[PDB]
Write a protein that binds this ligand. Structure first.
Ligand SMILES: c1ccc2c(NCCCCCNc3c4c(nc5ccccc35)CCCC4)c3c(nc2c1)CCCC3
Ligand SMILES: c1ccc2c(NCCCCCNc3c4c(nc5ccccc35)CCCC4)c3c(nc2c1)CCCC3
Ligand SMILES: *[C@@H]1O[C@H](CO)[C@@H](O)[C@H](O)[C@H]1NC(C)=O
Ligand SMILES: *[C@@H]1O[C@H](CO)[C@@H](O)[C@H](O)[C@H]1NC(C)=O
Ligand SMILES: *[C@@H]1O[C@H](CO)[C@@H](O)[C@H](O)[C@H]1NC(C)=O
Ligand SMILES: *[C@@H]1O[C@H](CO)[C@@H](O)[C@H](O)[C@H]1NC(C)=O
Lengths: 528, 528
């Protein structure tokens, strides 16, 4: 019986699932860790105590306790990201989609969701691995990890809440795949981890962390890189924010043991309800609890590590989307709404730059302004809107990622870079949002292959090309089958376009703006 | 007899001159000042002692003692600028081209040559006023003024060499036109002063200097503005350079009386031979002896004057040329030669920016670099060449001029702006030099109207349009005859293109680059 598998942790019973007029196996809800509840909250995950009896792996598990977006109640565009299961602190589970007939030892892809480290579930319809598993004969895993305070509260020094535990959760799921994936027909020596948003940052962080390097083969990062401004904080700032969280909940701030015991008493929703209140006011596009450069998971600064070659050397495939900033502006910069064209005013354009760079003086702001202002027309609302869109994009995702790929390529064993700029025919978000942060995921997981979803036939083509590049890379370290996506080299910096037009290669992705963000601006803020 | 005129200073006898199959009058070599020789050198001009008898005004006068360019011996492209008369310190003369029959009271245009304040004559074939006088029924005057040390040696405090005397020379010629031009049929209440290079800077300086404002009606500035970096120095720096000049000639440096008496003993060629030796090494595109902000001719800083509206309020017509920087690069930045395409190397591109902005740190240089580098291609010699061309242009002529026209327009009574980008069919300089600093002059003085000069028939058209705009403006304050050149306003910043294609209006001339040079860079150098 395919639906029955015996793992090092216990027998597991999966279920048969329909897919594109066929069927495959799916082991949903397998536990890889001990519920991080009660006195466990904020602690490193503990591995799941093995079990006798068969484990029902027929249905999706709970989603982790997280912030739920209600900006647009009922709107599909935003509800597709919210948890679609019951939220609980007992949420450390992974899912497996195994081809049928079960393979003997095939390519494994492990998905790490994103959500800025404050949100995210592995059970979203956009993360249904059945299409990719089926269309590409790959074993697909999707893991889960604690988010928000629950997975990132950091009181450096304490062992009750050292921080980064959400990343350890991830690592535990990865350890589990290394130890049992063979029983489902996956080859542990060929697992590719891939993620988008905080998931891409997370993927990058296991490339850096020595303790994670040996649990996977290759990596794929989508619109996220470890060095992104929103992905990490110092132990100093983490502690600052952790204290501040107790201040919001009326906790004895005497000692860490005290702090933690109160925080541990509060009901989940209580920490969620005040958790955005610790975010300092000069961090409008970031979230409160994120990975900490703690000296253990991250031996030194990400920058020195990137600089010295201190990281796993393998092949990597990463990329970004056309309009990375629209999401951030929509949810965090006034003047941008879901239903207007959100045209911006010169006066207001500048409050957005001031808003997207508090760490800058009237000189650094001028510098950003001069760089994104169109001096002959400048009173144009659209251009101003789009200018802010690019600023927030370039600064928060694209340029950090380009800096990472430039550094990574120096020591790596093959880099592949993409620029996804297709606007789905059925997008429910407005025109001004463009190709949105999060929207290449649909195509990577092959939702276009299902007619009910109203995509164009060519979009079914794009998704199929992407799914095949993704899986072919996972299987070989090269997206191309033995019309070629060229390696990204330090010299020629080539990359491709992912869209419906026929593939075209380009060079030096947003170099101009990224040389500004990466090299110039820093030197200037420092030199002033 | 037309050729005889009686002025407040003496009778003067001119001569008949042929022009475009016709004839006109020309009074060449009329003295407006007492020879500034002997104990006079470095002193304010003295007005010419009147005379009895008729003055022979039949032939061009001597040219002032100046540096003679021999970079390209025999080459027409550069020899057309060299003095074509005998050089002498007795050179303060003006020329007059009067229509025939002599007018009763017509438009007067007074030409002030340029030459960076180190060179220039009023007798160059490009400055032959006969064509413009004839084609437009205007009385045309061309003056002369001492240049180099002779006209600009500044020892603030001394009365033997206070500085700015070359500008006073100019003013004396202007005073003379105000007092006698009626006798030649010119209307003193309608004189327009116009000049190019230091001549345009000079024109601007009489708009600023209270002592000059009443000697003319309107002004025209061509590729020069008073605030240009190469047009002025502090009394401090002027004195510094004056001492340094004595050090080069073995002069007692005890006191100003001493210094000046030795400098006054040296033969002209002796000061010319060592005069570029005082130029500080962080001033590669400037010249040694230039106007000084002395508190008298210039009451305060040009910037405050421009800022407070402290200047003659009238109509002005000014403009710049496409490739203002090529001349400066050719004569002062290695790697640019008259006979190669002068392609530049990335490594070398940066030595040119470092070369064109010593007053900047590794941050200000980076800033210039980021602004003129094409990040995707950048190893391209042409683009690098052209990048340096624009940097030196924008910084030395165009942006200072745009800053002047923006400030001037705020208080003025009508501003007209042009962008001359026509490359003469018969240009003898190389392709990479483009539309050269100095090369619109040919068209303003109507050399194209003469077939022998090998211009195209359409270039005869362009020259005629320009000559008519220039004279029509001089006559009315508006280049347009009662296809319109629009006023340049602080709001719409419109300007036209001067070339052979049919006229097209544009907006905000090189705003992007000039906001960098005018507002951004300064703030940055200061803030660091
Ligand atoms: C107070 C309360 C909520 C806030 C907030 N919303 C957070 C809720 C939005 C998450 C929905 N989930 C989403 C995800 C992706 N793309 C989306 C694209 C459009 C809309 C929602 C998206 C990519 C993968 C990760 C999840 C955000 C901000 N500040 C807040 C301040 C700053 C900009 C980022 C979002
Ligand atoms: C040592 C010795 C001479 C130097 C020099 N030559 C000065 C001689 C060139 C003047 C010829 N006279 C010229 C004029 C115009 N355009 C030209 C355009 C092309 C060639 C010569 C030109 C516009 C009106 C003013 C006169 C120059 C420089 N440094 C020198 C360092 C720095 C760049 C400016 C010229
Ligand atoms: C597995 O759990 C689900 C949860 O509702 C249940 O409906 C299903 O029947 C279970 N399967 C078995 C055979 O235990
Ligand atoms: C990857 O590494 C292997 C040996 O370790 C080498 O043969 C191969 O060419 C490398 N490829 C790249 C792009 O570095
Ligand atoms: C005017 O001076 C020139 C100088 O050579 C001379 O040739 C000419 O004959 C003179 N004219 C008269 C009538 O004095
Ligand atoms: C120039 O000034 C006069 C009055 O001094 C005024 O009527 C005219 O409109 C002004 N033009 C401009 C452009 O300022």
């Amino acid at each position: 019986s395919e639906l029955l598998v015996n793992t090092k942790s216990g027998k597991v019973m999966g279920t048969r699932v329909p897919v594109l007029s066929s069927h495959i196996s799916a082991f949903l809800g397998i536990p890889f860790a001990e519920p991080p509840v009660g006195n466990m909250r904020f602690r490193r995950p503990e591995p799941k105590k093995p079990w006798s009896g068969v484990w029902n792996a027929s249905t999706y598990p709970n989603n982790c306790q997280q912030y739920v977006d209600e900006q647009f109640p009922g709107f599909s565009g935003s509800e597709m990201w919210n948890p679609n299961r019951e939220m609980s602190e007992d949420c450390l589970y992974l899912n497996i989609w195994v081809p049928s007939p079960r393979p003997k030892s095939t390519t494994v892809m492990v998905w790490i969701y994103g959500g800025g480290f404050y949100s995210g579930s592995s059970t979203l319809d956009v993360y249904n691995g059945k299409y990719l598993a089926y269309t590409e004969e790959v074993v697909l895993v999707s893991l889960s990890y604690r988010v928000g305070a629950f997975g990132f509260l950091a009181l450096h020094g304490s062992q009750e809440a050292p921080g980064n535990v959400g990343l350890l959760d991830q690592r535990m799921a990865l350890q589990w795949v290394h130890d049992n994936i063979q029983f489902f027909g996956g080859d542990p020596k060929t697992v590719t981890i891939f993620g988008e948003s905080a998931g891409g940052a997370s993927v990058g962080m296991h490339i850096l962390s020595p303790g994670s390097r040996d649990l996977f083969r290759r990596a794929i990062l989508q619109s996220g890189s470890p060095n992104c401004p929103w992905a990490s904080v110092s132990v100093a700032e983490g502690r600052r924010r952790a204290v501040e969280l107790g201040r919001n909940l009326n906790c004895n701030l005497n000692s860490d043991e005290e702090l933690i015991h109160c925080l541990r008493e509060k009901k989940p929703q209580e920490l969620i309800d005040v958790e955005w209140n610790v975010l300092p006011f000069d961090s409008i596009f970031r979230f409160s609890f994120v990975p900490v450069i703690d000296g253990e998971f991250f031996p030194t600064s990400l920058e020195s590590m990137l600089n010295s070659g201190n990281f796993k050397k393998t092949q990597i495939l990463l990329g970004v989307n056309k309009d990375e900033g629209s999401f951030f502006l929509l949810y965090g910069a006034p003047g941008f709404s879901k239903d207007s064209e959100s045209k911006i005013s010169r006066e207001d354009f500048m409050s957005g730059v001031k808003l997207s760079v508090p760490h800058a003086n009237d000189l650094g702001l001028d510098a950003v302004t001069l760089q994104y202002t169109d001096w002959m027309d400048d009173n144009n609302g659209i251009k101003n809107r789009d200018g802010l869109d690019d600023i927030v994009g370039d600064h928060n995702v694209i340029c950090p990622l380009m800096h990472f790929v430039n550094k990574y390529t120096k020591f790596g064993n093959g880099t592949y870079l993409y620029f996804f700029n297709h606007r789905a025919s059925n997008l429910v978000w407005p025109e001004w949002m463009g190709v949105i942060h999060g929207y290449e995921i649909e195509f990577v997981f092959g939702l276009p292959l299902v007619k009910e979803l109203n995509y164009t036939a060519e979009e079914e083509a794009l998704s199929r090309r992407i799914m095949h590049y993704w899986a072919t890379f996972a299987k070989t370290g090269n997206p191309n089958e033995p019309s070629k996506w060229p390696l990204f080299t330090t010299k020629e910096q080539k990359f491709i376009d992912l869209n419906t037009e026929p593939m075209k290669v380009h060079q030096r992705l947003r170099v101009q703006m990224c040389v500004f963000w990466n090299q110039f601006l820093p030197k200037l803020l420092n030199a002033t």
